[PDB]
Subunit: 645 residues, 3 copies
């Protein structure tokens, strides 16, 4: 209210009575300021329930001109027990981004740009009151991650990567964060555009102006060429360069970094461009002092007092540092501007501003594990390059699903040009994830692991000596639908076990050579057809045995030679024929029929005639009958399957 006169402070509560003596306000464009206010006043006790966590309003004035009325947060404050004759305080102010320093997350941003990624940490826990004075387009980040760090640390490092900076466009209603870059972004007052300069010849003057200049210049790197890798296009022209030479000795000495974190070429030519431009602020920076109360970090002006036709040009004030000083009364009615002071760091226009990086790159010093993800009913979610998708064990955003990550590559055992090893991670099983050069924005899947839900395949903690690979039917995980190859290396009990869950189809292009040292037992269920082109040879050192349980059937287009070295019997019920190596043919039946279309000869070298001689019976020796054969076949697999109870 309180127009007696003199001191008028509010927004959130500020007494008009409470006087101010000193301040000390540093800042840099793209950094926080701090205003070292030392107060003194009447009040003994005021609360802490807001004022420590909420604004103050300051009012710096160039009357008849660009008032600078201020409004910003209190973040550290104190009182002082030196004088019980009147209060004394301290009060350092810092802007609203500071209140994103004392905070911390682990959060993933996807398919967003790195201006409007920063809008959300603002908006979700804050206002819309910031502004946009950007002009070119930047990169729309596929996958950006605020890793472990503080939201304030997060936003600024990204702004620094992209050349965005900021300042506070000072407003009489609502405070403002100016998201900016380049000439056509900043702005300044009228008639004020050109500010004075004068050596105050009698020590001091009744006037506001400049009384100091210094132009410091260091040598700066000449060119920062960049390079990255691109597996999408593993042949492409990866290199990118930037160059801003000004004409002098020992200038164009080059820099070079690998991972500049780019995918597409032109974007890497921007990044080299932004980081090259920041370092060239240092090339030429200028140092001033004046008693003028209009300018501050971010402001543009033009100097006219220390002249050169085009030395003193446009000037963006980067870091204004200033002071207030007074021990003022209502005495000597009047009293005017009790002394002030300022100091300055400026630049130009065709020579433009960028921010120097200075922050640890979120320090992911080793691998994590993650669940390879997709909720129920699913088992396989890959892509064309054998990529999968994961949730890291830090997600308060979904029941991890196809949105938990970008696609992540897998590190196979053996991988070549459309040939080599492949086992893609199923959904729900855990992996090892590394990070290329340790960047939390660049996962890569580098191995698998077993846990309590995803348990080892075999008998553990027991047959450690077994090894192999066993798969699982997909869509349907029944604890035994699987193809497996398993080598067991336990002495005396070694084995190689191959299990085809359905069908097996072995193809050998030239020759094959099965050698078994003891026995083979082959048992096929329904049918075998074996076919061999040219010749089939079968040699058995001892007894060859064959039981047919149906009709046996043998066709030979030419000749079938049946040779014995002892004896040949064909026994067929009551009709038994027997050929012997001594040469005695024996035949028994129950009748016989002998027919020749043409002729028949029966001859000897002894006697023949007819009747009496051939045995009364040459018996079939028991076996002959069909029932007997049955069981020599059927003594097979008619097995039990009792049933449980």
């Amino acid at each position: 209210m309180q127009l007696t006169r003199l001191v008028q402070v509010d927004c959130p509560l500020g007494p008009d009575v409470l006087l101010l003596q000193r301040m000390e306000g540093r800042e840099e464009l793209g950094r926080l300021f701090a205003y070292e206010l030392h107060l003194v006043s009447e009040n003994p006790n005021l609360p802490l329930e807001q004022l420590l966590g909420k604004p103050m309003s300051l009012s710096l004035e160039l009357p008849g001109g660009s008032r600078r009325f201020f409004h910003g947060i209190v973040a550290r404050c104190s009182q002082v027990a030196g004088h019980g004759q009147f209060a004394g305080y301290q009060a350092t102010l810092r802007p609203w981004p500071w209140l994103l320093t004392r905070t911390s997350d682990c959060r993933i941003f996807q398919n967003q740009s790195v201006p409007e990624i920063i809008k959300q940490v603002f908006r979700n826990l804050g206002f819309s009151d910031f502004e946009d004075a950007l002009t070119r387009p930047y990169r729309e980040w596929e996958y950006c991650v605020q890793y472990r760090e503080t939201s304030f640390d997060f936003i600024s490092r990204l702004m620094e990567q992209e050349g965005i900076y900021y300042w506070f466009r000072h407003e009489q209603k609502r405070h403002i964060l100016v998201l900016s870059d380049a000439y056509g972004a900043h702005r300044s007052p009228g008639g004020y555009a050109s500010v004075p300069y004068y050596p105050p010849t009698l020590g001091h003057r009744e006037r506001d102006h400049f009384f100091d200049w210094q132009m410091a210049r260091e040598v700066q790197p000449g060119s920062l060429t960049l390079n990255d890798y691109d597996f999408q296009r593993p042949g492409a022209r990866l290199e990118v360069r930037s160059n801003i030479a000004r004409p002098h000795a020992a200038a164009d000495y080059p820099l070079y970094d690998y991972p500049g974190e780019y995918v597409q070429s032109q974007d890497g030519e921007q990044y080299a461009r932004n980081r090259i431009e920041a370092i060239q602020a240092q090339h030429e920076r200028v140092r001033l002092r004046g008693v003028v109360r209009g300018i501050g970090a971010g402001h543009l002006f033009r100097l006219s007092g220390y002249p050169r036709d085009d030395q003193n040009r446009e000037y963006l004030v980067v870091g204004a540092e200033y002071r207030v000083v007074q021990e003022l009364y209502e005495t000597g009615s009047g009293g005017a501007g009790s002394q002030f002071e300022s100091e300055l760091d400026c630049i130009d226009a065709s020579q433009s501003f960028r921010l120097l990086p200075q922050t640890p790159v979120p320090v992911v010093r080793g691998p994590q594990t993650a669940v390879v993800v997709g909720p129920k009913g699913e088992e396989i979610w890959t892509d064309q390059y054998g990529r999968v998708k994961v949730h890291f064990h830090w997600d308060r955003h979904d029941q991890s699903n196809e949105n938990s990550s970008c696609w992540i590559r897998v590190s196979q055992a053996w991988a070549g040009k459309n040939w080599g090893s492949m086992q893609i991670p199923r959904i729900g099983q855990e992996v090892i994830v590394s990070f290329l050069e340790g960047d939390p924005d660049r996962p890569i899947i580098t191995g698998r692991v077993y846990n309590a839900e995803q348990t080892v395949p075999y008998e553990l903690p027991a047959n450690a000596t077994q090894s192999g690979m066993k798969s699982r039917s997909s869509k349907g995980g029944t604890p035994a639908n699987f193809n497996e190859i398993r080598m067991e290396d336990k002495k005396g009990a070694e084995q190689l076990y191959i299990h085809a869950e359905r069908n097996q189809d072995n193809l050998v292009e030239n020759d094959a050579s099965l050698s078994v040292g003891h026995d083979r037992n082959k048992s096929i269920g329904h049918d075998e057809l074996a076919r061999i082109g040219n010749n089939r040879t079968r040699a058995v050192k001892l007894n060859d045995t064959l039981l047919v349980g149906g009709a046996k059937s043998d066709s030979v287009t030419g000749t079938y030679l049946i040779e014995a070295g002892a004896q040949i019997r064909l026994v067929c019920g009551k009709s038994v024929v027997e050929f012997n190596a001594d040469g005695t043919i024996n035949i028994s039946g129950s009748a016989f029929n002998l027919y020749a279309s043409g002729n028949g000869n029966i001859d000897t070298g002894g006697r023949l005639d007819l009747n009496s001689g051939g045995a009364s019976e040459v018996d079939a020796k028991g076996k002959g009958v069909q029932g007997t054969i049955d069981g020599q076949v059927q003594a097979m697999f008619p097995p039990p399957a009792k049933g449980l109870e």
Copy 2:
């Protein structure tokens, strides 16, 4: 001894003569102090053999009260050649933990708590003279590692992780390190419990008290929730939170970190609790100045001079900073307390103390290798989750064995719910070990490697084109007991070789389809039994050959049809039967017998009669005899095995 009067210093050698003027002693609870002593004295030369590496004794006095007689180590000292009129020195003191700064290890601690882990680096190279004033229980660490770092750096970071701090309980006999936490741990003198406060109205007073207060306060993070991963229980409620709000604006803004390094839940609720509590020291800290010689870092007191009913409460002095000043003689007989000075940082009780972390977390910036271990006679030491145990190549503690590590997980190629790849590392062979997020307390096994003792399986540095897997018999490593699958990819000489060290058991659930393009040679040693359920079909385009070396035996329950398209001979020594497609049956023997139980018919379409006609002999064409057959069988494998000499 030397009671003239005035200055009385000893333990390790201190002259009574040698006067002291200045000191400057800073400390913080949980940090080292340093006392900037500038001496002057008689002596020109005294040695360096101890005094630089050993104590001094100081004596600060509040006579008629709490004397503070001191005893601590010298760690940096100097003399000064300004005056040959009397000596001048410097002497900065620091406590005994400093003498664990200039040291360094790489050592593993197992199944120990993180109070009494610190007891050993103390005790093994030092004393038992420290104390314990702790009250709650902390975590008993399964696996804790002092990685590369200094013993002083090791102990303090752990104390900082667990909320333990310290101070020195000042003793007239033997110096003391107070391992502490919470109210019921600290302590203080009597009647001294309440110390004075007075603005020394005539500049100065004949009295000891306080003459300054300042209560600085910053805004602090509102809550640090934590989260970790737990593969033992990969479904569990990992999250843990902590909260200490005091009522003000912009307060309850949260923090969040992942790996807080916890296994079990409650312990993570402590860690969030300890780290949240440290940051809330900064919330409210108080700054004092007095001329009183009783208090120091760690001391508790209660102020009474600057009052508020409950503003000035209990006060644990966190960091006392103080001064001595004198140029004193035995003149103006008397002379009293030549001036002193102190400064202070205090806290309360229901608002309790914790340490701010500030030390690099032992910087394991990449993987190591390690030997997977167990001394002789052993080959396989795993557990239920397919874990093994390693020694890292830095052990001066055992011939590495089952105690070298905690169990470490392995990174398989393919791992799923009781299905997937397994090859567990044998004892003696080397691996690659990564560290989760780069923490030296969290190894994980991530790959294998060959070395000079553990050599590549094949012909190296030669058949680079071969690949595969070969196992080894376990318990018995004979350079050829093994199951192997080996693909060789050299053009013209390609091969797939499968080797079963004992037994092979292939199971196909539906169908199988072996196609070989050239030849197969199958040779079984002892027996084959092949059985097919339904039908067996065998078709050969050209000559089918069979040699039996024993008894051939063929049974068919129904019909055996034997069909030829040219000719059928059965030759049996001197009895040869020959059926021909034109229809001429030829039979030769040495006798024949023909019998029919019932009837016999012999018919023609030409003539028959008896005798003269059938050949004198239709010869067996040489082959018939048993000796011949032998060699057609036996021309097999009766091989040599000469013998070596």
Copy 3:
């Protein structure tokens, strides 16, 4: 030129007129100096095209003695607008290595030593004007990498690892960088070798000398033992120690680090030696002040004024810090040495100098990928330990080939003593490379990956459910010369497919047991020979069928028993024999011949006689003829192969 008198500065342009007042020159042996020159002069505008990037020449003089005429680079310079009454400037000088600070590379050095590795970054972008005063030999580095960092940062960290340091041997022609170590490397003037010392009793003297001493000493670590791993010799005595004790309390307290980055033993005993020696500079350092204008960092001298027989010995000045001061005219004709000042840090000889390390070790915080390399025509380049060679995606040095790297080990899935897994990376396919403990000089290959040129083997992005391994013919990558094992896990359509690109050779040591649940179809191209030692048993539950397309041939040394349970026919064109289980033998032909060498009997139990009875024809039932059999064989694989158009 300009001998009026007084001030004589040049090389690159320096006016004789332009006066100098202050300087402030700090340095440390093994670091850059900086000379804080504040100028004042006539000139308003001089250019910037060289002078900022090029030298100045200073001339410090001890007339009648060791002149110190200087010549060094300007790197940051400024002017000042305070006085338009005469100019004012600043000008900080720094040596020529500074101009390797504002630069950056990622470059590999191979089979070179770490003195003459530094020669090239010098020589390729600079002069030969440096010098060599080294005496012992150092390590010839197999593989050294300047990773990301600045050339100045690169050279100094390596010099610090090896104990080399430097200073500038000040020359009247051409400036000099002294690459040095040990006593016999430094040097100094004559008669000057011993410099004075005097307390300037009337405040000041007409003379140059010392007027201050201080000998500061801290306690230092007692011994730094080292240890590394050596897979070449995985059993060897890795440990190495160093020790320099001087006699005092709390001294011999040890250090220990693992990776000291050594291969061979003695070299690690040097590294422990160099790093132990640096820390023992701090053990004893000495602080001086004089008005003498001959000495500077690197200079050796001997003090004689503050005596002790052997306290004041040889003195290598490590860091001289000095000053100039004057506001001089040509007035009071004469005027002499307008005042100067210096300050000092010295050491000795038998106690020798080394550099303290202080630089981030190039921070490779995670893995890269790389192409495993060798240009066209090649597919496999390995060594004896299964190592390959890579180019990292940052090479501007070759079309990456056998010189791109040192040999790098691969991380197999399973690796043991001449047994275990092997798939060595082919040339052109990409890998994952980690770095042991994150050192850019120690790659290790830790996994594979697919990209756009090196594509997945199968149907992607489709049969994700298939897995396996497929190789490729080497020397000849035809998109189907390969051995493959492939498990397909899709329900109802599961399969195990084995493909041998040429030959397959399965060996089973004891038994084998093929069980197929449905059918087997085996088709061999040319020949099969099957042989079984003892007994072959074949049982078929239903119909056994055999078609021979050539000559069938069966030999049995003993007996062939042919048994039927229904009937046996042998049909051979027009001659059909039929034996039946009731006992009726039926024979039909077109003639028959029956012969017995000895006797013949034909008998019955009914009637016989001759003629009338046996059938007019028992027909062959159609099948008998050879054409029919043909197609029962030949209905096989006479397939089409139409042709494309």
